[PDB]
Amino acid sequence: MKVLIVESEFLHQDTWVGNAVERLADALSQQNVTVIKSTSFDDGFAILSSNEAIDCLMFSYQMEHPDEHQNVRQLIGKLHERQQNVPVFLLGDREKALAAMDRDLLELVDEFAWILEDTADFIAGRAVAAMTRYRQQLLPPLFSALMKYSDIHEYSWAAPGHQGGVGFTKTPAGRFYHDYYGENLFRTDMGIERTSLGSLLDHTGAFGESEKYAARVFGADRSWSVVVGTSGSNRTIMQACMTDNDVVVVDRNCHKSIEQGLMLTGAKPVYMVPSRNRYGIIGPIYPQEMQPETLQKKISESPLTKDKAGQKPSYCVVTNCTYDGVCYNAKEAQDLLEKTSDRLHFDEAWYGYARFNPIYADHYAMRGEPGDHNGPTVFATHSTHKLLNALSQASYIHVREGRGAINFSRFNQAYMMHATTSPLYAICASNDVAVSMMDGNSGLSLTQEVIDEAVDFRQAMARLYKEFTADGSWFFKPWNKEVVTDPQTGKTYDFADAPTKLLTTVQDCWVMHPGESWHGFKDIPDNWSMLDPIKVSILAPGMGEDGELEETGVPAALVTAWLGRHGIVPTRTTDFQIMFLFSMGVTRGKWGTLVNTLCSFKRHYDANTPLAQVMPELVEQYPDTYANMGIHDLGDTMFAWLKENNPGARLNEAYSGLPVAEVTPREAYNAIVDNNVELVSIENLPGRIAANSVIPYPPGIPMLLSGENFGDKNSPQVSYLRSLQSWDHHFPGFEHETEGTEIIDGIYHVMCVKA
């Protein structure tokens, strides 16, 4: 038990107050309470801004000057952001406190202690009971149950065989490994223990309680806890939603696990094509692609769906937000899509936090409270380890029940289908805690901080870009709205000059309006998508606002390599874009290290520092290519290549018309099983059918899926692979990653169904 005691600076002159507080702190030590003593409200505010966990706040209070009243409000306000239920003791004057007694006081203060008129032991006893009560309600229901149960549980005569870790201790390596992870991970790793705890696969007991909690917090009718990631989540939903008799509508921006659902169900796919901009960033699917008549036509025209014309699609999937933080107006999206399908699945894997900050209002599935069952059935999936706080593999299926709803009995057969009979309860616990953190005041507080940090980073870089540009020198710039408007005044600000409170709280600062050139999504309708403040792309010069390469530029590839030599690995990297991921796990000011490294890159680029000094692992690993070359020399050679080969346009061509779907993904998968596939060299790809998906980076969405034909000898899909290969060949050490290829002696191969 930790108590924070703030002595008000407005009473230091009344020394007897200090004496009385010391007597109380003494009484608290005697009962084994850890006592933190603060001598000003400001010291207290700062302690409460740290991650210091306390069980009780006590404070003294003169109650005369207006500045103190405010200090009190601020203090208890700060406490209650992330420590919402902590009990507050006023160590006050009876007369003054009772004169001031009203709803506002009681909102602030939970317990009253007349410091100059009571016994220290009495107050301390009351403080211990309050702290006990607080601690008893602190932990979420699954984590709490697992913990309690493991204190009584007999680890013998059942699996797991290690028996709360004892197995590992039996060899030195096992023992070292055991002590490195500590016992509690092993103690809470118990097998199915029902009447005690319940079952994950049955959704009973404390596992059930945890799922109900999750639903209340995330605004779903029902939530399913998953230990196989959003991979297992997506496989589950799709198993439950479609058979090989069904037509389905699939976002071309879909995860591998969406394709896996196709392969596992045998369903008949039609694809919604997303936009893109000059940076190779994938934008939203436009409203036009979601119109019921657009969908009807795709179905009628497609070789996979023709013979099922006019059949109602059983499932529809959209990825929201995208990898680069394009967030759809899901409320608008639902309206169009539900005119086609009764089952809507928004794959929100990177986006579980959205509900808990007003800035995302309307741009996610679980808006407001659930309960209105008139409308379609909606699934949202979260990888809670992505941008909530949880262990890898932790995941949720969130469900709003509507038309075409699927009851527990039916859906749980799909759940079990993709589950394990022996789940690791450490994962489930982290999933339970993930929810706790978003519950009440803290959900807002945690999300606001990520937004705040990302914005400070964004403004800093806008400011620096502006500064450098006035000296006729180049710099990186953030990818976000350039000119912003305060909606109360009518006042306009460039991004750098904007009040940060406007940027961090007003949605309109992020909305992609038509006519704004920054987003680069040509003819996007208004009020359709926004940019997530926390997905911060940074743009190296080289791409012009018209969508053509400039006379000079700085290739991100070289910047990403420089960054890496400092541990820093951006999540994504195009030709000029570099995306940095801000989360609830980031600490304040940490972005300052990004700036420092981008500045040091700039200083070396301009000095043209020999690669032997700045990138020695590159130079000694490829002596011939990079000897006698500086960093600017390499930027230059890399930019020449971009100019000569126009990969951006190659890209766009490869993504404009979908390749012809010859067979379904399942059918194409089955070719593998039938040993009826072979590795085809790049130059032989035209006319061959992909045995697996092909996902180039960039744009990091599928170019082909399994079962699609590469096309004729004029194939843009094959030619885009040609350019990636060429870049790889010309700049060793800077190779692209393409999912679904095999490189043989530097030559690209894809697995294809036999002739």
Tokens of 691: 């045995």
Residue 208, classified by CB atoms within 10 Å of its CB into exposed (0-12), middle (13-18) or buried (19+), is: middle
Q: Is 609 in the site for a copy of itself (CB under 8 A)?
A: no
For residues 55 and 66, give the distance between their C-alpha atoms in angstroms, rounded to a whole number: 28
- Among 505, 507, 583, 684, contact with a copy of itself (rule: CB under 8 A): 583
Residue 160, preceding peptide bond in cis (omega within 30° of 0): yes
Residue 407, classified by CB atoms within 10 Å of its CB into exposed (0-12), middle (13-18) or buried (19+), is: exposed
Q: Please list the residues that pair with 477 across neighbouring strands.
A: 539
Widest CA span in the chain: 95
Window 215-254: contact mask with ligand PLP (x via CB under 6 A): --------------xxx--x--------------------
Footprint on residues 426-465 left by a copy of itself (CB under 8 A): 426-427, 429-430, 433, 436-437, 442, 446, 456, 459-460, 463-464
- Among 350, 457, 591, 605, contact with ligand PLP (rule: CB under 6 A): 350
Cα-based torsion angle of the residue sequence 72, 77, 79, 85 in order, rounded to the nearest 10 degrees:
110
Residue 119, classified by CB atoms within 10 Å of its CB into exposed (0-12), middle (13-18) or buried (19+), is: exposed
- Among 309, 607, 640, 679, contact with a copy of itself (rule: CB under 8 A): 679
- Among 83, 150, 236, 257, contact with ligand PLP (rule: CB under 6 A): 257
From the list 162-170, 213-221, 337-345, 482-490, the region that binds a copy of itself by CB under 8 A is 162-170
Alpha helices, H only, 491-581: 500-503, 556-564
- Among 31, 34, 53, 65, contact with a copy of itself (rule: CB under 8 A): 53
Q: Please list the residues that pair with 248 across neighbouring strands.
A: 269, 315
Footprint on residues 2-21 left by a copy of itself (CB under 8 A): 14-16, 19-20
Partner from a copy of itself, ligand PLP, none contacting 164, C-beta within 5 to 8 A by type: a copy of itself
By beta-carbon proximity to a copy of itself, the closer residue of 239 and 723 is: 239
By beta-carbon proximity to ligand PLP, the closer residue of 132 and 420 is: 420
Partner from a copy of itself, ligand PLP, none contacting 101, C-beta within 5 to 8 A by type: a copy of itself
- Among 387, 631, 634, 705, contact with a copy of itself (rule: CB under 8 A): 387
Residue with tokens 């976000």: 480
By beta-carbon proximity to ligand PLP, the closer residue of 231 and 709 is: 231
Least CB distance to ligand PLP at residue 587 (A): 24
Number of chain positions touching a copy of itself (CB under 8 A): 177
Q: Please list the residues that pair with 33 across neighbouring strands.
A: none
Assign 324 to helix, strand or coil. coil
Partner from a copy of itself, ligand PLP, none contacting 234, C-beta within 5 to 8 A by type: ligand PLP
Q: Compute the Cα dihedral for 671, 675, 679, 685 and give only its sign.
A: negative
Cβ(165)–Cβ(186) under 8 Å?
Answer: yes
Footprint on residues 19-48 left by a copy of itself (CB under 8 A): 19-20, 23, 38-40, 42-43, 45-46
List Cβ<8 Å contacts ≥24 apart for 606-615.
606/473, 606/632, 607/632, 608/632, 608/633, 614/562, 615/561, 615/562, 615/565
Partner from a copy of itself, ligand PLP, none contacting 656, C-beta within 5 to 8 A by type: none
What letter would DSSP give residue 694?
B
Rounded to 5 degrees, φ, ψ at 120 are -50, -45
Window 410-429: contact mask with ligand PLP (x via CB under 6 A): ----------xxx-------
For residues 390 and 529, give the distance between their C-alpha atoms in angstroms, rounded to a whole number: 28
Footprint on residues 131-190 left by ligand PLP (CB under 6 A): none
Nearest to 143 by CA among 434, 442, 445: 434
By beta-carbon proximity to a copy of itself, the closer residue of 114 and 641 is: 114
- Among 26, 31, 67, 159, contact with a copy of itself (rule: CB under 8 A): 159
Rounded to 5 degrees, φ, ψ at 4 are -95, 125
Cα distance between the two ends of the chain: 73
By beta-carbon proximity to ligand PLP, the closer residue of 384 and 445 is: 384
- Among 128, 390, 506, 531, contact with a copy of itself (rule: CB under 8 A): 390
By beta-carbon proximity to a copy of itself, the closer residue of 264 and 304 is: 264
Window 642-671: contact mask with a copy of itself (x via CB under 8 A): ---------------------------xx-
Footprint on residues 294-323 left by ligand PLP (CB under 6 A): 319
Cβ(711)–Cβ(660) under 8 Å?
Answer: yes
Footprint on residues 371-390 left by ligand PLP (CB under 6 A): 383
Q: Is 409 in the site for ligand PLP (CB under 6 A)?
A: no
Q: Is 693 in the site for ligand PLP (CB under 6 A)?
A: no
By beta-carbon proximity to a copy of itself, the closer residue of 173 and 755 is: 173
Least CB distance to a copy of itself at residue 102 (A): 6
For residues 551 and 639, give the distance between their C-alpha atoms in angstroms, rounded to a whole number: 9
Assign 151 to helix, strand or coil. coil
Least CB distance to ligand PLP at residue 37 (A): 45
- Among 55, 347, 401, 449, contact with ligand PLP (rule: CB under 6 A): 347
Cβ(194)–Cβ(158) under 8 Å?
Answer: no
DSSP letters for 638-655: HHHHHHHH-HHHHHHHHH
Q: Which residues bind ligand PLP (CB under 6 A)?
A: 229-231, 234, 255, 257, 319, 347, 349-350, 383, 395, 420-422
